[PDB]
Design an enzyme around this catalytic site. Structure first.
Site, PDB file in Angstrom:
ATOM      1  N   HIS A  61      42.660  88.602  23.612  1.00  0.00           N
ATOM      2  CA  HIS A  61      42.084  89.255  22.441  1.00  0.00           C
ATOM      3  C   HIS A  61      42.450  90.757  22.357  1.00  0.00           C
ATOM      4  O   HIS A  61      42.523  91.326  21.251  1.00  0.00           O
ATOM      5  CB  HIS A  61      40.571  89.025  22.486  1.00  0.00           C
ATOM      6  CG  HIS A  61      40.243  87.559  22.492  1.00  0.00           C
ATOM      7  ND1 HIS A  61      39.812  86.868  23.606  1.00  0.00           N
ATOM      8  CD2 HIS A  61      40.315  86.652  21.484  1.00  0.00           C
ATOM      9  CE1 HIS A  61      39.627  85.596  23.283  1.00  0.00           C
ATOM     10  NE2 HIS A  61      39.903  85.443  22.000  1.00  0.00           N
ATOM     11  N   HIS A  91      38.973  99.271  25.982  1.00  0.00           N
ATOM     12  CA  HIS A  91      40.014  98.506  25.277  1.00  0.00           C
ATOM     13  C   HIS A  91      40.199  99.094  23.905  1.00  0.00           C
ATOM     14  O   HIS A  91      39.433  99.939  23.475  1.00  0.00           O
ATOM     15  CB  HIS A  91      39.622  96.999  25.194  1.00  0.00           C
ATOM     16  CG  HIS A  91      38.368  96.778  24.424  1.00  0.00           C
ATOM     17  ND1 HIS A  91      37.113  96.871  25.007  1.00  0.00           N
ATOM     18  CD2 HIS A  91      38.174  96.705  23.082  1.00  0.00           C
ATOM     19  CE1 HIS A  91      36.197  96.714  24.041  1.00  0.00           C
ATOM     20  NE2 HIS A  91      36.827  96.615  22.852  1.00  0.00           N
ATOM     21  N   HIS A  93      41.438  98.165  19.607  1.00  0.00           N
ATOM     22  CA  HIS A  93      41.744  97.315  18.483  1.00  0.00           C
ATOM     23  C   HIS A  93      42.778  98.018  17.634  1.00  0.00           C
ATOM     24  O   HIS A  93      42.717  99.242  17.453  1.00  0.00           O
ATOM     25  CB  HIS A  93      40.501  97.058  17.593  1.00  0.00           C
ATOM     26  CG  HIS A  93      39.337  96.566  18.390  1.00  0.00           C
ATOM     27  ND1 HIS A  93      39.079  95.207  18.525  1.00  0.00           N
ATOM     28  CD2 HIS A  93      38.440  97.223  19.151  1.00  0.00           C
ATOM     29  CE1 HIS A  93      37.969  95.084  19.307  1.00  0.00           C
ATOM     30  NE2 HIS A  93      37.601  96.291  19.749  1.00  0.00           N
ATOM     31  N   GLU A 103      38.101  99.273  13.575  1.00  0.00           N
ATOM     32  CA  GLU A 103      36.918  98.400  13.237  1.00  0.00           C
ATOM     33  C   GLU A 103      35.890  99.182  12.403  1.00  0.00           C
ATOM     34  O   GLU A 103      35.609  98.828  11.258  1.00  0.00           O
ATOM     35  CB  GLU A 103      36.325  97.961  14.586  1.00  0.00           C
ATOM     36  CG  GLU A 103      37.316  96.987  15.263  1.00  0.00           C
ATOM     37  CD  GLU A 103      36.652  96.023  16.159  1.00  0.00           C
ATOM     38  OE1 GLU A 103      35.799  96.428  16.985  1.00  0.00           O
ATOM     39  OE2 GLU A 103      36.982  94.817  16.062  1.00  0.00           O
ATOM     40  N   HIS A 116      37.457 101.672  22.427  1.00  0.00           N
ATOM     41  CA  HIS A 116      36.069 101.401  22.801  1.00  0.00           C
ATOM     42  C   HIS A 116      35.922 101.518  24.300  1.00  0.00           C
ATOM     43  O   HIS A 116      36.512 100.748  25.084  1.00  0.00           O
ATOM     44  CB  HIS A 116      35.763  99.963  22.441  1.00  0.00           C
ATOM     45  CG  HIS A 116      35.575  99.815  20.958  1.00  0.00           C
ATOM     46  ND1 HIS A 116      35.611  98.586  20.341  1.00  0.00           N
ATOM     47  CD2 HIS A 116      35.434 100.743  19.991  1.00  0.00           C
ATOM     48  CE1 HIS A 116      35.466  98.728  19.042  1.00  0.00           C
ATOM     49  NE2 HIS A 116      35.358 100.036  18.764  1.00  0.00           N
ATOM     50  N   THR A 195      31.588  93.686  18.954  1.00  0.00           N
ATOM     51  CA  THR A 195      32.350  93.302  17.777  1.00  0.00           C
ATOM     52  C   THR A 195      33.227  92.050  17.986  1.00  0.00           C
ATOM     53  O   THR A 195      33.987  91.686  17.081  1.00  0.00           O
ATOM     54  CB  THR A 195      33.288  94.445  17.338  1.00  0.00           C
ATOM     55  OG1 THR A 195      34.355  94.656  18.258  1.00  0.00           O
ATOM     56  CG2 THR A 195      32.540  95.751  17.135  1.00  0.00           C
TER      57      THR A 195
HETATM   58  O1  LIG Z   1      30.666  94.709  26.254  1.00  0.00           O
HETATM   59  C1  LIG Z   1      31.105  95.032  24.951  1.00  0.00           C
HETATM   60  C2  LIG Z   1      32.338  94.550  24.482  1.00  0.00           C
HETATM   61  C3  LIG Z   1      32.710  94.865  23.169  1.00  0.00           C
HETATM   62  C4  LIG Z   1      31.893  95.638  22.290  1.00  0.00           C
HETATM   63  O2  LIG Z   1      32.315  95.948  20.981  1.00  0.00           O
HETATM   64  C5  LIG Z   1      30.689  96.141  22.769  1.00  0.00           C
HETATM   65  C6  LIG Z   1      30.314  95.841  24.125  1.00  0.00           C
HETATM   66 ZN   LIG Z   2      36.067  96.659  20.964  1.00  0.00          ZN
END
Ligand SMILES: Oc1ccc(O)cc1
Ligand SMILES: [Zn+2]
Length: 257
Positions: A61, A91, A93, A103, A116, A195
């Protein structure tokens, strides 16, 4: 399983994860004119000096840089947060084109990507128990625009060739996530969710106003990754973003006047 295509993308996730249509889903559009300055917010503290990165992983992903969270080493506190949240992973997006990929959006503006940095509330003992709580997680979100290279990103770009496909990992020690932060910590905050599935409603979001700039060459290297595993038909890892969800009964608060 779930993903980002026509047949298994965001508009389908509610079938397996009905919280997808819940009351505090992320991401959201941040309407800058409607966000209110909150003088009740304490200073934000991003304390990443002792961060211990361990590994980078393609999970099919996104890719995740994972940290040692067995002790308080890299933490977020202050701002909207009560207590101390430990960094577990980051990570991104991103888009197939520079005009999309984030996002969160800002007055409906999509950035080329969004970082993020995921943290969990140490009152809950570990991440798995934190995601059972409404204040279990805090995610620092940072927008990327295409422009000048970000030098502190290039060690991530250079290892991507080694985790091209789903389930690949590599060593990724001694990486300093301070190199991904913009100069200003002015932010917007609101209560939201993961998300990606399982879309759990545990997250205090803290979205920085200042984007970081990355180069076209850096973001093009993200777009060479694959959603599929080795020896399956190639599906480029692009457009792995969920669109903005209804704000519902929430207010977005600004840290700055
Ligand atoms: O553990 C998480 C993974 C993705 C998110 O967007 C928020 C927390
Ligand atoms: Zn994310």
């Amino acid at each position: 399983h779930w993903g980002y295509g026509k047949h298994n993308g965001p508009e389908h996730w509610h079938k397996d994860f009905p919280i997808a249509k819940g009351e505090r889903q992320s991401p959201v559009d941040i309407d800058t004119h409607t966000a209110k300055y909150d003088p009740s917010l304490k200073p934000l503290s991003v304390s990443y000096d002792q961060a211990t990165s361990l590994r980078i992983l393609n999970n099919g992903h996104a890719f995740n840089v994972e940290f040692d969270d067995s002790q308080d080493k890299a933490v977020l506190k202050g701002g909207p947060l009560d207590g101390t949240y430990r960094l577990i992973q980051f990570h991104f997006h991103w888009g197939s084109l520079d005009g999309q990929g984030s996002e969160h959006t800002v007055d409906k503006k999509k950035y080329a990507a969004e970082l993020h940095l995921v943290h969990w509330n140490t009152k809950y003992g570990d991440f798995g128990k934190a995601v059972q709580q409404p204040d279990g997680l805090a995610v620092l979100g940072i927008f990327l625009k295409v422009g000048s290279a970000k030098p502190g990103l290039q060690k991530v770009v250079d290892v991507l060739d080694s985790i091209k496909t789903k389930g690949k990992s590599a060593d990724f020690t001694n990486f300093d996530p301070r190199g991904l932060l913009p100069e200003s910590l002015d932010y917007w905050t609101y209560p939201g969710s993961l998300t990606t599935p399982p879309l759990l409603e545990c997250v205090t979001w803290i979205v920085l106003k200042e984007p970081i700039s990355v180069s076209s060459e850096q973001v093009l290297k993200f777009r060479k990754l694959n959603f599929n595993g080795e020896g399956e038909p190639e599906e480029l890892m692009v457009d792995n973003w969920r669109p903005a969800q209804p704000l519902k009964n929430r207010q977005i608060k600004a840290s700055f006047k």
